[PDB]
């Protein structure tokens, strides 16, 4: 495994470790995820492992989307935290060209808003 490129995060003590890549299988290092990102463990940091099939997890950092307050809609999901890939409906008081919103790598798509 060569030095891990980690989208939306990175390895800890990067510069102490960098000089020793590529590394052998069985190796694993503590890494962190960027703001609006979390590891599959739920934390913003976990450990990445060097496996026959490359680095694992394959997606070390995932976007979390926070469900915003709906000015003119029902706020049952207000403050709720969702992981990259989920879709939801907006029970608007108003509306969304339009109605379902998904947590994308760049955030909510489309923007969850009534009117």
């Amino acid at each position: 495994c060569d030095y891990p490129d980690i989208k939306h995060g990175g390895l800890y003590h990067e510069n102490m470790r960098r000089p020793y890549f590529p590394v052998a299988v069985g190796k694993y290092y503590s890494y962190y995820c960027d703001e609006h990102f979390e590891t599959p463990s739920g934390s913003y940091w976990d450990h990445i492992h060097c496996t026959q099939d490359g680095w694992s997890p394959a997606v070390p950092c995932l976007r979390k989307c926070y469900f915003p307050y709906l000015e003119n809609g029902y706020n049952q999901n207000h403050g709720r935290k969702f992981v990259q890939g989920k879709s939801i409906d907006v029970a608007c008081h108003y509306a969304l060209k339009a109605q379902t919103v998904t947590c994308m790598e760049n955030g909510w798509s489309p923007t969850p808003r009534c009117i």
Binding site: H13, M16, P19, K27, Y44
Partner: protein
């Protein structure tokens, strides 16, 4: 001098290390609230931390809160205890998580204990300016979750440019490992570093990294990540006796 370091500013008669830049302790756009002994300050990615006020060769403790500004509102992401071990030419920080943000609701905190090593800074020793022969032996402290009684012993052979150490007296047996022989390499800035494997029972359980500090490589500081039957992080700090 807890409530000092947070309020008092760096004047420099203070014993070193005097300053410590917070990079891995605080994310880009996040805030780290430290408090202790009637004092309180906020940081601060890149912000400095007055360590000259803290005691040497000991762990300084502070209360902490990790937040993030979401729509003109600060949201707590984690809270617990912030630890700081200072030496003369080096120092490092650790985080003892006591509570983390709920996985479902942002505004609900959950009790979760996690320990990790943050920053590892100081007066980096130039790889190109390391001694040329001889062996320096470093004695110091190894600290993990709920345990700062660990003993660190590390030897460096400047001729072979290799290092090897040992961890002892940690309440958790699985943490008293050996720091296998590792090669000293130059940093991206040409700072002397050392990374190798960690062993328990003649068995690879993880890795460790050390930075060499002081113009005469008087100290070594870093961390170890050990696989146990329950992965644990260990803070490492050792120094070679003064002349």
């Amino acid at each position: 001098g807890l409530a000092d370091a947070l309020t008092a500013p760096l004047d420099h008669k203070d014993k070193g290390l005097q300053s410590l830049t917070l990079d891995q302790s605080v994310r880009k756009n996040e805030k780290l609230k430290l408090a202790a002994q009637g004092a309180e300050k906020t940081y601060g990615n890149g912000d400095s931390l007055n360590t000259g006020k803290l005691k040497n060769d000991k762990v300084s403790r502070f209360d902490f809160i990790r937040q993030i500004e979401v729509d003109g509102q600060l949201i707590t992401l984690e809270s617990g205890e912030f630890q700081v071990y200072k030496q003369s030419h080096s120092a490092l920080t650790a985080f003892q998580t006591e509570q983390i943000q709920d996985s479902e609701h942002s505004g609900k905190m959950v009790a979760k204990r996690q320990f990790r090593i943050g920053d590892i800074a100081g007066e980096h020793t130039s790889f190109d300016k390391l001694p040329e022969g001889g062996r320096a032996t470093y004695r110091g402290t190894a600290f993990g979750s709920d345990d700062a009684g660990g003993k660190l012993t590390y030897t460096i052979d400047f001729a072979a440019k290799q290092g090897n150490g040992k961890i002892e007296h940690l309440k958790s047996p699985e943490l008293n490992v050996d720091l296998a022989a590792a090669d000293i390499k130059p940093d991206g800035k040409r700072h002397a570093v050392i990374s190798g494997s960690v062993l328990y029972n003649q068995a690879e359980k993880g890795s460790y990294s050390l930075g060499i500090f002081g113009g005469k490589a008087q100290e070594v500081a870093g961390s170890a990540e050990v696989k146990t039957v329950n992965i644990r992080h260990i803070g490492l700090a050792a120094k070679q006796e003064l002349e």
